[PDB]
Amino acid sequence: YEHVTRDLNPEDFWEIIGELGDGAFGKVYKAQNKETSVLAAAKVIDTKSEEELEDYMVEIDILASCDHPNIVKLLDAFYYENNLWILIEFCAGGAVDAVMLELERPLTESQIQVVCKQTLDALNYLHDNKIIHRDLKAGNILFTLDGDIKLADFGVSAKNTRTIQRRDSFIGTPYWMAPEVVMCETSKDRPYDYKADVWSLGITLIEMAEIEPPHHELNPMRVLLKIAKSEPPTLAQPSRWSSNFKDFLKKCLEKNVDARWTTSQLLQHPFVTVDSNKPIRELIAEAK
Amino acid sequence: YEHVTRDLNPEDFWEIIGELGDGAFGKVYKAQNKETSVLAAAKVIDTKSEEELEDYMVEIDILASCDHPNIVKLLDAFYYENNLWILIEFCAGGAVDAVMLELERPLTESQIQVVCKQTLDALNYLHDNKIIHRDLKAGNILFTLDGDIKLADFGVSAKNTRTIQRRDSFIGTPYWMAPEVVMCETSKDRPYDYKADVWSLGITLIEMAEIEPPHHELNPMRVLLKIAKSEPPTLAQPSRWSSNFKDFLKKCLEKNVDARWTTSQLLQHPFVTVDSNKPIRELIAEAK
Ligand SMILES: Nc1nc(Nc2ccc(S(N)(=O)=O)cc2)nn1C(=S)Nc1c(F)cccc1F
Ligand SMILES: Nc1nc(Nc2ccc(S(N)(=O)=O)cc2)nn1C(=S)Nc1c(F)cccc1F
Ligand SMILES: [Cl-]
Ligand SMILES: [Cl-]
């Protein structure tokens, strides 16, 4: 594959130092490059077969093809002895949700504004490049040593670039072509499907304000129904938060998809008019 | 591949009798099975490499996976000596546009109603199965010996089944999931993109009424702009046609995609309340 190395042992290049996490696709390791000492998160995924490699390729391609300050970069990928190894630039601060559980408190508003401003830069880049993240949450937002964030986990992301390029491809005179296809207003080019990330952004903000996401107290079987039935969630103790926080949430957490703001529109919102990460440097300093 | 035979010579099974057509992907042959005498259209596509096979796989999969009276079936596919052979059930009457050029006249209204009624059955089936044809025109509607039609050419079709199945796939509790994703109102499940076939249906009807499609007289470079700028096309000599023909066209040829009818809705329209192919049997009898 374009970005996956064959026939070489990943541990002749990368040394495992310890375990970072552990989830549904196995354990994630802290790796260190044996030549350069560069640190990595190493995902090691058991594959029963080779056809399974196709299930992980969109993620690899997104990581390898993205070049943004607030998206994690691909350092290496190996297929060796029935495992896919994915090495990702290391974010020394860990995930936002892991910090809140360690400090046993939510983020402050000024801290949320920084994460939000940078997270939004990442999403805007993704959407501009026809990528939908599809699993935005506090656990997939990582803190760097310098108090910045990077967005991670493209395991269920969609990349519409090849399908856009394929569908625009025609030959001969297209007398029969629908005007929305003529006008490049097919679903691949309209905001509609990308706006699902905007809603998840809103939920992540409440998750950062309150440690846990809305409906965390329900039987998990009820959560999808609850989202369907309910008005959009709001902050539980609204006096604690600014009008700008509350107003930003309402542009995100809007069930009418046409009325929900794009990442482009949200970048002009005063809640993200910040340019210093000092509140996050203070937070990650207390966690270190 | 799931539906493509390797290592066997297609001409040890199928005998070429002659040429049917000739287009951008080469010549199409009239083939005859050497054991059974069953007739086929044989597409023979030059491939420079094996990676190119992926470009033709969605089409093969659609043909192999569809089971409808008014869609052409896959009889065989072979990869041999750098060519992909695709064998498709033979429609002895040829394409609708080829008949109009042979007889040098358009279809009558009663003939259009039959083609339309059957073409619509095919599309409804496709859309129900998450397939967009994407190249509906009179040249891709074939007449059978019995006066029925079959829809062909899935060379640029979209099949959203695997991508729908992939995107519904989640694990753990989805607190962050947008309500339109909860409610299965993503673009894969909404009518929006499938309605592009409905518009092409409308143009094909005018093409059958008038031999050539709207704007056939323009410089080909102008046609896309003309579709963009213009109100939807209408029949050139409207006194020749029934109110039901004209009204059916307006439900199809509607620029507001939300207001354009689905194939489901169009099946209830009186223009397609027909159940005899006798007008088409009369037409194909004159062409034989
Ligand atoms: N790029 C990256 N850096 C890190 N650093 C990290 C992770 C956990 C911890 S820990 N165990 O919380 O102290 C510390 C640093 N994790 N990480 C990734 S990609 N983690 C991660 C993730 F965020 C989501 C899914 C799978 C993963 F492996
Ligand atoms: N299934 C099928 N049957 C036929 N029959 C046919 C075609 C041409 C003629 S001819 N040359 O007009 O008399 C007669 C019968 N053609 N055909 C197909 S799939 N034709 C065709 C097509 F309709 C669109 C694209 C490529 C194709 F090869
Ligand atoms: Cl982790
Ligand atoms: Cl042909």
Curated annotation (Swiss-Prot), chains A, B:
UniProt modified residues of type Phosphoserine: 169
Family stated for the protein in its record: Belongs to the protein kinase superfamily. STE Ser/Thr protein kinase family. STE20 subfamily.
Free-text function comment from the UniProt entry: Mediates apoptosis and actin stress fiber dissolution.
Range covered out of full length: 21 to 308 of 1235
Domain (Protein kinase) ranges: 14-272
UniProt-annotated catalytic positions: 135
Amino-acid positions noted as binding ATP in the UniProt annotation, renumbered to this chain: 20-28, 43
PTM remark: Proteolytically cleaved by caspase-3.
Organs and tissues of expression: Ubiquitously expressed. Highest expression is found in heart and in skeletal muscle.
Compartment(s) where it occurs, according to its Swiss-Prot or TrEMBL record: Cytoplasm
Name of the molecule in the record: STE20-like serine/threonine-protein kinase
Organism ancestry: Eukaryota, Metazoa, Chordata, Craniata, Vertebrata
Domain of life: Eukaryota
Residues with the Phosphothreonine modification: 163
